[PDB]
Specification:
The structure is cut from a larger assembly and holds two copies of chain A.
Chain A (H helix, E strand, L loop, with lengths): L1 H5 L2 H19 L1 H7 L13
Organism (chain B): Homo sapiens (Human)
Subcellular location (chain B): Cell membrane; Membrane, Clathrin-coated pit; Cytoplasmic vesicle; Presynapse
Protein name (chain B): Dynamin-1
């Protein structure tokens, strides 16, 4: 049981979290990034 | 301690005690020392 939990617990987290937040970064980040905030008073130049 | 000014808020007190002919417009419009979060002007109770 220890072997079959060690061989399987990385897979479940990395199918539900890694390869899903990565897909979200590919295909949805801009869509909601446009929506959050003003979309106009965003990406304002830092004083530097 | 906070170079980018992301967790810093500036407050200007004693706005009623400024010299005759002077005003804090240049600093309250966040132009004199541009800070990201802006400057809030308050007027507390005098010692009297």
């Amino acid at each position: 049981v220890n072997k079959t939990v060690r061989d399987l617990m990385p897979k479940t987290i990395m199918h539900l979290m890694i390869n899903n937040t990565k897909e979200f970064i590919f295909s949805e980040l801009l869509a909601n990034l446009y929506s959050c905030g003003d979309q106009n008073t965003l990406m304002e130049e830092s004083a530097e | 301690v906070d170079p980018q000014g992301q967790r810093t808020i500036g407050v200007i007190t004693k706005l009623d005690l400024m010299d005759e002919g002077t005003d804090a417009r240049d600093v309250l419009e966040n132009k004199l020392l541009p800070l990201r979060r802006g400057y809030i002007g308050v007027v507390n109770r005098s010692q009297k």
